[PDB]
Amino acid sequence: GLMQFTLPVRLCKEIELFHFDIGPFENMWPGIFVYMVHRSCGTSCFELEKLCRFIMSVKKNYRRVPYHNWKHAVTVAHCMYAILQNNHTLFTDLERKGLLIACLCHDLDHRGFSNSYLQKFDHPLAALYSTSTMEQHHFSQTVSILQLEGHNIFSTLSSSEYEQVLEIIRKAIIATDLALYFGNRKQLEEMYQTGSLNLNNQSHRDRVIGLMMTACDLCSVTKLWPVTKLTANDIYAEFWAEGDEMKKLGIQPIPMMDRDKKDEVPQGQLGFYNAVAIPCYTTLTQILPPTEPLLKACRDNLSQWEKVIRGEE
Ligand SMILES: COc1ncc(C2CC2)nc1C(=O)N[C@@H]1CCN(c2ccc(Cl)cn2)C1
Ligand SMILES: [Mg+2]
Ligand SMILES: [Zn+2]
């Protein structure tokens, strides 16, 4: 009960900032996550014995892939922590509980392949889940791990709070499917501008949490340039492997995924920043003004990519 996690002074200060990097020491990531839960939620939210056992079963079920790995889980959970701490009073006790867990679990058992490649490969998961294939699998994996003996971090909730938290986690994980992002943001855009956005409306909250999940998921584009630049390599390592596997199925991959077309990457990042990232953090900033630092960092990085193209790096 009186066992807190503390961090060294540099991490203790930097962890509160949106652009924090969790560092290369894997063995510190669980403590960083429990630190964030204790400050976001309270030292009482979860039995520590059960949280630690849940955290380590989730780590085990992330694979050794270049990008969709344990480091991504904890990175995405940290961005959600930053959003929740910068927007104290807007979120319920259950929402803070659910969303940090949703983020840590959102890519459970990712193999590094898009939903597209699963469908062209004709993977069993594509027969089981026609849309949001991997995301339905990740939520499935979350429930499986919650049901292991000794792993049920929600055991002390009432029946109905338990059903509320699992519903929050399911919608939050489905929202990380970028194919659903475009429509979600366009609706949140219309609703903010026509003045109809209402946070007491559950279906509006659902949409707003969805956009938070997209924002945390893409948070690589909101770090300091040297972190953003080095993560891009990990992101492209998966893309190119997927492109390689498309060629094995006899399908020319889109140039983004073709490792012969590396020249085209800086322009690929422009496209992605303008079409996805900038609009995402814009709408988020309009709805939750204290998340502006994400939009500012994202614009800073757009400009760094513009510099790469102009040959200035
Ligand atoms: C060039 O792509 C990227 N570069 C950097 C990062 C960093 C945030 C990690 N992420 C991506 C990305 O998620 N691209 C994905 C591939 C292209 N994008 C897309 C567009 C429409 C639909 Cl329906 C699906 N996918 C998303
Ligand atoms: Mg995902
Ligand atoms: Zn992710």
Swiss-Prot record:
| Cell compartment(s), UniProt | Cytoplasm, Cytosol
Q: Which residues bind 3',5'-cyclic AMP?
A: 68, 269
- Catalytic residues (positions): 68 (proton donor)
Residues that, per the record, bind 3',5'-cyclic GMP: 68, 269
Binding residue positions for a divalent metal cation 2: 107
Task: Pinpoint the PDEase domain residues.
Answer: 1-312
Coiled-coil positions are none
Provide the free-text tissue specificity comment from this protein's UniProt record: Abundant in the putamen and caudate nucleus regions of brain and testis, moderately expressed in the thyroid gland, pituitary gland, thalamus and cerebellum.
The function of this protein is: Plays a role in signal transduction by regulating the intracellular concentration of cyclic nucleotides. Can hydrolyze both cAMP and cGMP, but has higher affinity for cAMP and is more efficient with cAMP as substrate. May play a critical role in regulating cAMP and cGMP levels in the striatum, a region of the brain that contributes to the control of movement and cognition.
Q: What disease has this protein been linked to?
A: Dyskinesia, limb and orofacial, infantile-onset: An autosomal recessive, early-onset hyperkinetic movement disorder characterized by axial hypotonia, dyskinesia of the limbs and trunk, orofacial dyskinesia, drooling, and dysarthria. The severity of the hyperkinesis is variable. Striatal degeneration, autosomal dominant 2: An autosomal dominant disorder characterized by striatal degeneration and dysfunction of basal ganglia, resulting in hyperkinesis.
Subunit info here reads: Homodimer.
**Identification of the protein by name:** cAMP and cAMP-inhibited cGMP 3',5'-cyclic phosphodiesterase 10A
**Covered residues of the complete protein?**
724 to 1036 of 1055
